[PDB]
């Protein structure tokens, strides 16, 4: 009933019709917090696309599903996953989007050791995406390795906008407790009204993923890790001796407890650490299909 009501709402904003009419060979390739991801073949072309399928009845905040169509309509960009169409299919929202065949950054940080050229490439690409989003008041709010996808040729794109929000003159700060515990900014855990700064903190934690292979406190259960992030000084690299002074200096601009003193995306784009960034090709050897070839 509220379900039926919500379906009818989603229909108002999505494309008409049914992509099963033009896609074949759905194969499940992963699951996130809002739904599953399949690849599919476009029948006419043989081209591959990704289809995110999000059940309207299995969301913590089902109104956040509108984030998909806000981003799709308004905030497309070369470092954001291309989103082609959205549909209401039975009790699910489907988004047909680009297939990022280089996979998620998670697989790389789990199995591989990135060098600083590679790390600098990912950070530069993400910061390009964030500078543009933040300038328009869009906060991603779930920055972590799982949200960073790669093309086959090593180009970096943000994905998983399901938890994003907008700030504006009339709504200058957000308050919602949103994100993934280990990556959450301390002001957000503290329930202080917050802005785009929270994404810069989360990026800092992703740098720690890239250097150490996991976020701080990853062995603690989530409710307990958030307490630690809230209460303690900024987390430290397990492997400080393994990072250049340039990278440590960069990281120290991200993991600042006071949001007003944290570097902004625009400022971070000028950091000397990012001069180390290799081209997309530098990332390609880390990918599953290449690293044991
Ligand atoms: C883990 N996340 C996803 O699987 C995903 C999410 N949104 C868009 C996508 N395009 N291509 C993929 C996979 C190939 C990584 C995705």
PDB file of C-alpha atoms and ligand atoms in Angstrom:
ATOM      1  CA  UNK A   1       0.000   0.000   0.000  1.00  0.00           C
ATOM      2  CA  UNK A   2       2.733   2.471   0.921  1.00  0.00           C
ATOM      3  CA  UNK A   3       4.656   0.070  -1.356  1.00  0.00           C
ATOM      4  CA  UNK A   4       2.082   0.492  -4.157  1.00  0.00           C
ATOM      5  CA  UNK A   5       2.144   4.217  -3.463  1.00  0.00           C
ATOM      6  CA  UNK A   6       5.946   4.356  -3.731  1.00  0.00           C
ATOM      7  CA  UNK A   7       5.999   2.349  -6.978  1.00  0.00           C
ATOM      8  CA  UNK A   8       3.539   4.828  -8.493  1.00  0.00           C
ATOM      9  CA  UNK A   9       5.862   7.690  -7.443  1.00  0.00           C
ATOM     10  CA  UNK A  10       8.924   6.093  -9.023  1.00  0.00           C
ATOM     11  CA  UNK A  11       6.988   5.603 -12.273  1.00  0.00           C
ATOM     12  CA  UNK A  12       6.592   9.402 -12.493  1.00  0.00           C
ATOM     13  CA  UNK A  13      10.389   9.882 -12.789  1.00  0.00           C
ATOM     14  CA  UNK A  14      11.758   6.789 -14.640  1.00  0.00           C
ATOM     15  CA  UNK A  15      11.756   5.954 -18.346  1.00  0.00           C
ATOM     16  CA  UNK A  16       8.704   4.039 -19.652  1.00  0.00           C
ATOM     17  CA  UNK A  17       9.040   0.424 -20.652  1.00  0.00           C
ATOM     18  CA  UNK A  18      11.124  -2.606 -19.887  1.00  0.00           C
ATOM     19  CA  UNK A  19      14.812  -3.152 -20.795  1.00  0.00           C
ATOM     20  CA  UNK A  20      14.239  -6.954 -20.821  1.00  0.00           C
ATOM     21  CA  UNK A  21      12.772  -6.109 -24.232  1.00  0.00           C
ATOM     22  CA  UNK A  22      16.288  -5.219 -25.559  1.00  0.00           C
ATOM     23  CA  UNK A  23      18.735  -7.067 -23.220  1.00  0.00           C
ATOM     24  CA  UNK A  24      19.771 -10.762 -23.069  1.00  0.00           C
ATOM     25  CA  UNK A  25      21.874 -12.973 -20.833  1.00  0.00           C
ATOM     26  CA  UNK A  26      21.576 -11.273 -17.444  1.00  0.00           C
ATOM     27  CA  UNK A  27      24.428 -12.508 -15.271  1.00  0.00           C
ATOM     28  CA  UNK A  28      24.784 -11.381 -11.644  1.00  0.00           C
ATOM     29  CA  UNK A  29      28.231  -9.891 -11.059  1.00  0.00           C
ATOM     30  CA  UNK A  30      27.842  -8.305  -7.560  1.00  0.00           C
ATOM     31  CA  UNK A  31      25.629  -6.816  -4.809  1.00  0.00           C
ATOM     32  CA  UNK A  32      25.801  -3.466  -2.983  1.00  0.00           C
ATOM     33  CA  UNK A  33      23.771  -2.062  -0.057  1.00  0.00           C
ATOM     34  CA  UNK A  34      20.772  -1.032  -2.240  1.00  0.00           C
ATOM     35  CA  UNK A  35      20.638  -3.960  -4.714  1.00  0.00           C
ATOM     36  CA  UNK A  36      22.382  -6.319  -7.150  1.00  0.00           C
ATOM     37  CA  UNK A  37      24.398  -5.663 -10.307  1.00  0.00           C
ATOM     38  CA  UNK A  38      24.086  -7.854 -13.398  1.00  0.00           C
ATOM     39  CA  UNK A  39      25.786  -7.600 -16.759  1.00  0.00           C
ATOM     40  CA  UNK A  40      23.598  -7.933 -19.815  1.00  0.00           C
ATOM     41  CA  UNK A  41      24.069  -8.041 -23.567  1.00  0.00           C
ATOM     42  CA  UNK A  42      22.352  -5.508 -25.794  1.00  0.00           C
ATOM     43  CA  UNK A  43      20.718  -7.826 -28.356  1.00  0.00           C
ATOM     44  CA  UNK A  44      21.000  -5.503 -31.409  1.00  0.00           C
ATOM     45  CA  UNK A  45      24.704  -4.630 -30.941  1.00  0.00           C
ATOM     46  CA  UNK A  46      26.348  -7.359 -28.800  1.00  0.00           C
ATOM     47  CA  UNK A  47      27.465  -4.479 -26.495  1.00  0.00           C
ATOM     48  CA  UNK A  48      27.557  -5.049 -22.759  1.00  0.00           C
ATOM     49  CA  UNK A  49      25.823  -2.934 -20.100  1.00  0.00           C
ATOM     50  CA  UNK A  50      25.408  -3.153 -16.348  1.00  0.00           C
ATOM     51  CA  UNK A  51      21.979  -3.269 -14.718  1.00  0.00           C
ATOM     52  CA  UNK A  52      21.544  -2.276 -11.071  1.00  0.00           C
ATOM     53  CA  UNK A  53      18.398  -3.808  -9.599  1.00  0.00           C
ATOM     54  CA  UNK A  54      17.150  -2.276  -6.359  1.00  0.00           C
ATOM     55  CA  UNK A  55      14.116  -3.798  -4.600  1.00  0.00           C
ATOM     56  CA  UNK A  56      11.731  -1.097  -3.383  1.00  0.00           C
ATOM     57  CA  UNK A  57      10.897  -3.174  -0.279  1.00  0.00           C
ATOM     58  CA  UNK A  58      14.495  -3.813   0.868  1.00  0.00           C
ATOM     59  CA  UNK A  59      15.767  -0.249   1.383  1.00  0.00           C
ATOM     60  CA  UNK A  60      16.609   1.363   4.760  1.00  0.00           C
ATOM     61  CA  UNK A  61      15.407   4.722   3.308  1.00  0.00           C
ATOM     62  CA  UNK A  62      13.482   3.981   0.135  1.00  0.00           C
ATOM     63  CA  UNK A  63      13.201   7.732  -0.697  1.00  0.00           C
ATOM     64  CA  UNK A  64      16.983   7.702  -1.345  1.00  0.00           C
ATOM     65  CA  UNK A  65      16.299   5.670  -4.547  1.00  0.00           C
ATOM     66  CA  UNK A  66      15.432   9.052  -6.174  1.00  0.00           C
ATOM     67  CA  UNK A  67      19.195   9.839  -5.884  1.00  0.00           C
ATOM     68  CA  UNK A  68      19.752   7.495  -8.856  1.00  0.00           C
ATOM     69  CA  UNK A  69      17.510   9.552 -11.128  1.00  0.00           C
ATOM     70  CA  UNK A  70      18.740  12.950  -9.816  1.00  0.00           C
ATOM     71  CA  UNK A  71      22.359  11.975 -10.607  1.00  0.00           C
ATOM     72  CA  UNK A  72      21.378  10.396 -13.943  1.00  0.00           C
ATOM     73  CA  UNK A  73      19.516  13.522 -15.100  1.00  0.00           C
ATOM     74  CA  UNK A  74      21.788  16.247 -13.762  1.00  0.00           C
ATOM     75  CA  UNK A  75      25.378  15.310 -12.719  1.00  0.00           C
ATOM     76  CA  UNK A  76      26.794  13.122 -15.530  1.00  0.00           C
ATOM     77  CA  UNK A  77      30.601  13.747 -15.957  1.00  0.00           C
ATOM     78  CA  UNK A  78      33.605  11.865 -17.356  1.00  0.00           C
ATOM     79  CA  UNK A  79      34.654  10.614 -13.882  1.00  0.00           C
ATOM     80  CA  UNK A  80      31.085   9.522 -13.022  1.00  0.00           C
ATOM     81  CA  UNK A  81      29.631   6.233 -14.271  1.00  0.00           C
ATOM     82  CA  UNK A  82      27.407   6.857 -17.327  1.00  0.00           C
ATOM     83  CA  UNK A  83      23.777   6.128 -16.493  1.00  0.00           C
ATOM     84  CA  UNK A  84      21.612   5.547 -19.575  1.00  0.00           C
ATOM     85  CA  UNK A  85      18.056   4.830 -18.453  1.00  0.00           C
ATOM     86  CA  UNK A  86      15.979   3.966 -15.390  1.00  0.00           C
ATOM     87  CA  UNK A  87      12.878   1.774 -15.281  1.00  0.00           C
ATOM     88  CA  UNK A  88      10.331   0.394 -12.820  1.00  0.00           C
ATOM     89  CA  UNK A  89      10.373  -3.376 -13.354  1.00  0.00           C
ATOM     90  CA  UNK A  90       7.884  -5.125 -11.118  1.00  0.00           C
ATOM     91  CA  UNK A  91       8.897  -4.257  -7.526  1.00  0.00           C
ATOM     92  CA  UNK A  92      12.413  -3.065  -8.511  1.00  0.00           C
ATOM     93  CA  UNK A  93      14.119   0.069  -9.782  1.00  0.00           C
ATOM     94  CA  UNK A  94      16.455  -0.848 -12.638  1.00  0.00           C
ATOM     95  CA  UNK A  95      19.225   1.416 -13.793  1.00  0.00           C
ATOM     96  CA  UNK A  96      20.891   0.516 -17.093  1.00  0.00           C
ATOM     97  CA  UNK A  97      24.379   1.963 -17.006  1.00  0.00           C
ATOM     98  CA  UNK A  98      27.934   1.668 -18.217  1.00  0.00           C
ATOM     99  CA  UNK A  99      29.731  -1.631 -17.499  1.00  0.00           C
ATOM    100  CA  UNK A 100      33.052  -0.707 -15.822  1.00  0.00           C
ATOM    101  CA  UNK A 101      34.955  -3.794 -16.878  1.00  0.00           C
ATOM    102  CA  UNK A 102      38.092  -2.830 -14.894  1.00  0.00           C
ATOM    103  CA  UNK A 103      36.034  -3.665 -11.817  1.00  0.00           C
ATOM    104  CA  UNK A 104      35.900  -2.009  -8.388  1.00  0.00           C
ATOM    105  CA  UNK A 105      38.943  -0.601  -6.604  1.00  0.00           C
ATOM    106  CA  UNK A 106      38.110  -3.011  -3.729  1.00  0.00           C
ATOM    107  CA  UNK A 107      39.473  -6.046  -5.623  1.00  0.00           C
ATOM    108  CA  UNK A 108      42.777  -4.204  -6.265  1.00  0.00           C
ATOM    109  CA  UNK A 109      43.313  -2.974  -2.684  1.00  0.00           C
ATOM    110  CA  UNK A 110      42.455  -6.492  -1.374  1.00  0.00           C
ATOM    111  CA  UNK A 111      44.867  -8.492  -3.591  1.00  0.00           C
ATOM    112  CA  UNK A 112      47.542  -6.058  -4.824  1.00  0.00           C
ATOM    113  CA  UNK A 113      49.953  -3.348  -3.589  1.00  0.00           C
ATOM    114  CA  UNK A 114      49.459  -0.038  -5.375  1.00  0.00           C
ATOM    115  CA  UNK A 115      52.484   2.204  -5.940  1.00  0.00           C
ATOM    116  CA  UNK A 116      52.254   5.983  -5.493  1.00  0.00           C
ATOM    117  CA  UNK A 117      51.897   6.679  -9.211  1.00  0.00           C
ATOM    118  CA  UNK A 118      48.756   4.465  -9.157  1.00  0.00           C
ATOM    119  CA  UNK A 119      47.502   5.911  -5.849  1.00  0.00           C
ATOM    120  CA  UNK A 120      48.037   9.452  -7.201  1.00  0.00           C
ATOM    121  CA  UNK A 121      46.103   8.557 -10.365  1.00  0.00           C
ATOM    122  CA  UNK A 122      43.061   7.323  -8.368  1.00  0.00           C
ATOM    123  CA  UNK A 123      43.099  10.316  -5.990  1.00  0.00           C
ATOM    124  CA  UNK A 124      43.415  12.819  -8.849  1.00  0.00           C
ATOM    125  CA  UNK A 125      40.486  11.264 -10.745  1.00  0.00           C
ATOM    126  CA  UNK A 126      38.273  11.090  -7.634  1.00  0.00           C
ATOM    127  CA  UNK A 127      39.161  14.682  -6.676  1.00  0.00           C
ATOM    128  CA  UNK A 128      38.282  15.857 -10.206  1.00  0.00           C
ATOM    129  CA  UNK A 129      34.837  14.204  -9.752  1.00  0.00           C
ATOM    130  CA  UNK A 130      34.371  15.607  -6.231  1.00  0.00           C
ATOM    131  CA  UNK A 131      35.445  19.160  -7.187  1.00  0.00           C
ATOM    132  CA  UNK A 132      32.684  19.283  -9.812  1.00  0.00           C
ATOM    133  CA  UNK A 133      30.046  17.638  -7.574  1.00  0.00           C
ATOM    134  CA  UNK A 134      30.888  19.716  -4.490  1.00  0.00           C
ATOM    135  CA  UNK A 135      30.823  22.974  -6.525  1.00  0.00           C
ATOM    136  CA  UNK A 136      27.221  22.054  -7.334  1.00  0.00           C
ATOM    137  CA  UNK A 137      26.384  21.162  -3.695  1.00  0.00           C
ATOM    138  CA  UNK A 138      26.300  17.380  -4.262  1.00  0.00           C
ATOM    139  CA  UNK A 139      27.829  15.277  -1.466  1.00  0.00           C
ATOM    140  CA  UNK A 140      28.468  11.622  -2.340  1.00  0.00           C
ATOM    141  CA  UNK A 141      28.602  10.452   1.312  1.00  0.00           C
ATOM    142  CA  UNK A 142      29.798   6.901   0.517  1.00  0.00           C
ATOM    143  CA  UNK A 143      33.358   7.293  -0.723  1.00  0.00           C
ATOM    144  CA  UNK A 144      35.312   4.018  -0.308  1.00  0.00           C
ATOM    145  CA  UNK A 145      37.114   1.577  -2.620  1.00  0.00           C
ATOM    146  CA  UNK A 146      33.803  -0.173  -3.510  1.00  0.00           C
ATOM    147  CA  UNK A 147      32.444   3.114  -4.946  1.00  0.00           C
ATOM    148  CA  UNK A 148      35.403   3.623  -7.327  1.00  0.00           C
ATOM    149  CA  UNK A 149      35.158   1.709 -10.638  1.00  0.00           C
ATOM    150  CA  UNK A 150      37.596   1.341 -13.526  1.00  0.00           C
ATOM    151  CA  UNK A 151      37.196   1.054 -17.299  1.00  0.00           C
ATOM    152  CA  UNK A 152      39.237  -1.721 -18.970  1.00  0.00           C
ATOM    153  CA  UNK A 153      41.851   0.910 -19.907  1.00  0.00           C
ATOM    154  CA  UNK A 154      42.157   2.158 -16.321  1.00  0.00           C
ATOM    155  CA  UNK A 155      39.969   5.306 -16.265  1.00  0.00           C
ATOM    156  CA  UNK A 156      38.486   6.020 -12.799  1.00  0.00           C
ATOM    157  CA  UNK A 157      34.779   6.731 -12.211  1.00  0.00           C
ATOM    158  CA  UNK A 158      32.602   7.303  -9.144  1.00  0.00           C
ATOM    159  CA  UNK A 159      29.592   5.050  -8.675  1.00  0.00           C
ATOM    160  CA  UNK A 160      27.060   4.210  -5.897  1.00  0.00           C
ATOM    161  CA  UNK A 161      25.368   7.603  -5.486  1.00  0.00           C
ATOM    162  CA  UNK A 162      22.482   5.982  -3.613  1.00  0.00           C
ATOM    163  CA  UNK A 163      23.313   7.866  -0.372  1.00  0.00           C
ATOM    164  CA  UNK A 164      24.156  11.267  -1.902  1.00  0.00           C
ATOM    165  CA  UNK A 165      22.482  14.560  -0.816  1.00  0.00           C
ATOM    166  CA  UNK A 166      22.509  18.213  -1.890  1.00  0.00           C
ATOM    167  CA  UNK A 167      23.400  21.365   0.016  1.00  0.00           C
ATOM    168  CA  UNK A 168      22.446  24.890  -1.061  1.00  0.00           C
ATOM    169  CA  UNK A 169      21.993  28.409   0.263  1.00  0.00           C
ATOM    170  CA  UNK A 170      18.589  27.299   1.657  1.00  0.00           C
ATOM    171  CA  UNK A 171      19.912  23.950   2.992  1.00  0.00           C
ATOM    172  CA  UNK A 172      23.590  24.652   3.799  1.00  0.00           C
ATOM    173  CA  UNK A 173      24.286  21.431   5.798  1.00  0.00           C
ATOM    174  CA  UNK A 174      23.115  17.812   6.003  1.00  0.00           C
ATOM    175  CA  UNK A 175      22.451  15.955   9.270  1.00  0.00           C
ATOM    176  CA  UNK A 176      21.649  12.342   8.274  1.00  0.00           C
ATOM    177  CA  UNK A 177      23.742   9.462   9.622  1.00  0.00           C
ATOM    178  CA  UNK A 178      24.715   7.992   6.257  1.00  0.00           C
ATOM    179  CA  UNK A 179      27.706   6.111   4.808  1.00  0.00           C
ATOM    180  CA  UNK A 180      29.823   3.083   5.753  1.00  0.00           C
ATOM    181  CA  UNK A 181      30.984   3.037   9.399  1.00  0.00           C
ATOM    182  CA  UNK A 182      34.763   2.746   8.893  1.00  0.00           C
ATOM    183  CA  UNK A 183      34.819   5.539   6.265  1.00  0.00           C
ATOM    184  CA  UNK A 184      32.484   8.018   8.033  1.00  0.00           C
ATOM    185  CA  UNK A 185      33.790  11.540   8.898  1.00  0.00           C
ATOM    186  CA  UNK A 186      33.984  12.212  12.695  1.00  0.00           C
ATOM    187  CA  UNK A 187      31.645  15.282  12.568  1.00  0.00           C
ATOM    188  CA  UNK A 188      29.085  13.036  10.805  1.00  0.00           C
ATOM    189  CA  UNK A 189      29.406  10.291  13.455  1.00  0.00           C
ATOM    190  CA  UNK A 190      29.085  13.105  16.073  1.00  0.00           C
ATOM    191  CA  UNK A 191      25.784  14.281  14.476  1.00  0.00           C
ATOM    192  CA  UNK A 192      27.155  17.751  13.691  1.00  0.00           C
ATOM    193  CA  UNK A 193      25.535  19.330  10.591  1.00  0.00           C
ATOM    194  CA  UNK A 194      28.031  18.691   7.785  1.00  0.00           C
ATOM    195  CA  UNK A 195      28.935  19.500   4.204  1.00  0.00           C
ATOM    196  CA  UNK A 196      31.063  18.200   1.284  1.00  0.00           C
ATOM    197  CA  UNK A 197      34.059  18.047   3.687  1.00  0.00           C
ATOM    198  CA  UNK A 198      32.875  14.563   4.789  1.00  0.00           C
ATOM    199  CA  UNK A 199      33.810  13.163   1.339  1.00  0.00           C
ATOM    200  CA  UNK A 200      37.396  14.443   1.773  1.00  0.00           C
ATOM    201  CA  UNK A 201      37.696  12.534   5.073  1.00  0.00           C
ATOM    202  CA  UNK A 202      36.250   9.414   3.451  1.00  0.00           C
ATOM    203  CA  UNK A 203      38.820   9.753   0.617  1.00  0.00           C
ATOM    204  CA  UNK A 204      41.545   9.896   3.289  1.00  0.00           C
ATOM    205  CA  UNK A 205      40.304   6.556   4.626  1.00  0.00           C
ATOM    206  CA  UNK A 206      40.402   5.193   1.058  1.00  0.00           C
ATOM    207  CA  UNK A 207      44.068   6.272   0.831  1.00  0.00           C
ATOM    208  CA  UNK A 208      44.643   4.148   3.961  1.00  0.00           C
ATOM    209  CA  UNK A 209      42.836   1.289   2.178  1.00  0.00           C
ATOM    210  CA  UNK A 210      45.187   1.756  -0.779  1.00  0.00           C
ATOM    211  CA  UNK A 211      48.365   1.797   1.376  1.00  0.00           C
ATOM    212  CA  UNK A 212      47.417  -0.646   4.215  1.00  0.00           C
ATOM    213  CA  UNK A 213      44.825  -2.861   2.390  1.00  0.00           C
ATOM    214  CA  UNK A 214      42.023  -2.055   4.874  1.00  0.00           C
ATOM    215  CA  UNK A 215      40.446   0.983   6.631  1.00  0.00           C
ATOM    216  CA  UNK A 216      41.329   1.707  10.308  1.00  0.00           C
ATOM    217  CA  UNK A 217      39.524  -0.351  12.970  1.00  0.00           C
ATOM    218  CA  UNK A 218      38.266  -2.808  10.351  1.00  0.00           C
ATOM    219  CA  UNK A 219      38.464  -5.685  12.887  1.00  0.00           C
ATOM    220  CA  UNK A 220      36.196  -3.793  15.331  1.00  0.00           C
ATOM    221  CA  UNK A 221      32.415  -4.287  14.889  1.00  0.00           C
ATOM    222  CA  UNK A 222      30.951  -1.150  13.191  1.00  0.00           C
ATOM    223  CA  UNK A 223      29.127   0.529  16.147  1.00  0.00           C
ATOM    224  CA  UNK A 224      32.411   0.295  18.108  1.00  0.00           C
ATOM    225  CA  UNK A 225      34.628   1.582  15.236  1.00  0.00           C
ATOM    226  CA  UNK A 226      32.436   4.716  14.869  1.00  0.00           C
ATOM    227  CA  UNK A 227      32.910   5.430  18.606  1.00  0.00           C
ATOM    228  CA  UNK A 228      36.666   5.160  18.048  1.00  0.00           C
ATOM    229  CA  UNK A 229      36.616   7.459  14.991  1.00  0.00           C
ATOM    230  CA  UNK A 230      34.490   9.985  16.915  1.00  0.00           C
ATOM    231  CA  UNK A 231      36.685   9.958  20.049  1.00  0.00           C
ATOM    232  CA  UNK A 232      40.291   9.388  18.862  1.00  0.00           C
ATOM    233  CA  UNK A 233      42.865  11.437  17.007  1.00  0.00           C
ATOM    234  CA  UNK A 234      43.064  10.892  13.206  1.00  0.00           C
ATOM    235  CA  UNK A 235      43.971   7.270  12.351  1.00  0.00           C
ATOM    236  CA  UNK A 236      47.581   6.465  11.452  1.00  0.00           C
ATOM    237  CA  UNK A 237      48.945   4.460   8.520  1.00  0.00           C
ATOM    238  CA  UNK A 238      50.072   1.009   9.772  1.00  0.00           C
ATOM    239  CA  UNK A 239      52.879   1.408   7.182  1.00  0.00           C
ATOM    240  CA  UNK A 240      54.088   5.043   7.624  1.00  0.00           C
ATOM    241  CA  UNK A 241      57.651   4.090   6.604  1.00  0.00           C
ATOM    242  CA  UNK A 242      56.326   2.891   3.233  1.00  0.00           C
ATOM    243  CA  UNK A 243      54.877   6.239   2.063  1.00  0.00           C
ATOM    244  CA  UNK A 244      56.740   9.211   0.530  1.00  0.00           C
ATOM    245  CA  UNK A 245      56.769  12.529   2.509  1.00  0.00           C
ATOM    246  CA  UNK A 246      54.612  13.883  -0.398  1.00  0.00           C
ATOM    247  CA  UNK A 247      51.885  11.238   0.243  1.00  0.00           C
ATOM    248  CA  UNK A 248      51.970  11.697   4.045  1.00  0.00           C
ATOM    249  CA  UNK A 249      51.646  15.484   3.547  1.00  0.00           C
ATOM    250  CA  UNK A 250      48.707  14.864   1.188  1.00  0.00           C
ATOM    251  CA  UNK A 251      47.007  12.501   3.633  1.00  0.00           C
ATOM    252  CA  UNK A 252      47.445  14.995   6.478  1.00  0.00           C
ATOM    253  CA  UNK A 253      45.257  17.467   4.504  1.00  0.00           C
ATOM    254  CA  UNK A 254      42.463  14.811   4.286  1.00  0.00           C
ATOM    255  CA  UNK A 255      42.335  13.275   7.780  1.00  0.00           C
ATOM    256  CA  UNK A 256      41.754  16.578   9.689  1.00  0.00           C
ATOM    257  CA  UNK A 257      39.169  16.228  12.495  1.00  0.00           C
ATOM    258  CA  UNK A 258      37.983  19.846  12.173  1.00  0.00           C
ATOM    259  CA  UNK A 259      36.044  20.100   8.874  1.00  0.00           C
ATOM    260  CA  UNK A 260      36.870  23.845   8.549  1.00  0.00           C
ATOM    261  CA  UNK A 261      40.614  23.024   8.497  1.00  0.00           C
ATOM    262  CA  UNK A 262      40.342  20.007   6.130  1.00  0.00           C
ATOM    263  CA  UNK A 263      41.478  20.699   2.557  1.00  0.00           C
ATOM    264  CA  UNK A 264      38.740  21.055  -0.101  1.00  0.00           C
ATOM    265  CA  UNK A 265      38.715  19.093  -3.341  1.00  0.00           C
ATOM    266  CA  UNK A 266      39.589  22.260  -5.296  1.00  0.00           C
ATOM    267  CA  UNK A 267      42.599  22.866  -3.005  1.00  0.00           C
ATOM    268  CA  UNK A 268      43.719  19.196  -3.122  1.00  0.00           C
ATOM    269  CA  UNK A 269      43.816  19.253  -6.941  1.00  0.00           C
ATOM    270  CA  UNK A 270      46.921  21.532  -6.593  1.00  0.00           C
ATOM    271  CA  UNK A 271      48.741  19.317  -4.063  1.00  0.00           C
ATOM    272  CA  UNK A 272      52.248  18.243  -5.267  1.00  0.00           C
ATOM    273  CA  UNK A 273      51.465  14.576  -4.440  1.00  0.00           C
ATOM    274  CA  UNK A 274      49.136  14.534  -7.450  1.00  0.00           C
ATOM    275  CA  UNK A 275      52.014  15.433  -9.825  1.00  0.00           C
ATOM    276  CA  UNK A 276      53.019  11.736  -9.305  1.00  0.00           C
ATOM    277  CA  UNK A 277      49.753  10.562 -10.942  1.00  0.00           C
ATOM    278  CA  UNK A 278      50.348   8.140 -13.778  1.00  0.00           C
ATOM    279  CA  UNK A 279      48.073   7.873 -16.829  1.00  0.00           C
ATOM    280  CA  UNK A 280      45.132   5.376 -16.812  1.00  0.00           C
ATOM    281  CA  UNK A 281      47.394   2.704 -18.316  1.00  0.00           C
ATOM    282  CA  UNK A 282      49.406   2.678 -15.033  1.00  0.00           C
ATOM    283  CA  UNK A 283      46.341   1.134 -13.240  1.00  0.00           C
ATOM    284  CA  UNK A 284      45.593  -1.584 -15.817  1.00  0.00           C
ATOM    285  CA  UNK A 285      48.195  -4.157 -14.556  1.00  0.00           C
ATOM    286  CA  UNK A 286      46.546  -4.193 -11.069  1.00  0.00           C
ATOM    287  CA  UNK A 287      43.216  -5.551 -12.468  1.00  0.00           C
ATOM    288  CA  UNK A 288      42.282  -9.209 -11.899  1.00  0.00           C
ATOM    289  CA  UNK A 289      42.388 -10.103 -15.645  1.00  0.00           C
ATOM    290  CA  UNK A 290      45.952  -8.691 -15.978  1.00  0.00           C
ATOM    291  CA  UNK A 291      47.904  -9.214 -12.779  1.00  0.00           C
ATOM    292  CA  UNK A 292      48.394 -13.004 -13.161  1.00  0.00           C
ATOM    293  CA  UNK A 293      48.389 -13.026 -16.993  1.00  0.00           C
TER     294      UNK A 293
HETATM  295  C1  LIG B   1      30.431  -3.313  -7.293  1.00  0.00           C
HETATM  296  N1  LIG B   1      29.748  -2.335  -8.118  1.00  0.00           N
HETATM  297  C2  LIG B   1      29.325  -2.679  -9.331  1.00  0.00           C
HETATM  298  O1  LIG B   1      29.422  -3.858  -9.715  1.00  0.00           O
HETATM  299  C3  LIG B   1      28.785  -1.608 -10.244  1.00  0.00           C
HETATM  300  C4  LIG B   1      27.951  -0.591  -9.769  1.00  0.00           C
HETATM  301  N2  LIG B   1      27.456   0.370 -10.571  1.00  0.00           N
HETATM  302  C5  LIG B   1      27.772   0.384 -11.897  1.00  0.00           C
HETATM  303  C6  LIG B   1      28.585  -0.583 -12.470  1.00  0.00           C
HETATM  304  N3  LIG B   1      29.083  -0.783 -13.718  1.00  0.00           N
HETATM  305  N4  LIG B   1      29.895  -1.887 -13.754  1.00  0.00           N
HETATM  306  C7  LIG B   1      29.941  -2.391 -12.518  1.00  0.00           C
HETATM  307  C8  LIG B   1      30.793  -3.577 -12.145  1.00  0.00           C
HETATM  308  C9  LIG B   1      31.406  -4.204 -13.381  1.00  0.00           C
HETATM  309  C10 LIG B   1      31.912  -3.203 -11.175  1.00  0.00           C
HETATM  310  C11 LIG B   1      29.123  -1.594 -11.640  1.00  0.00           C
END
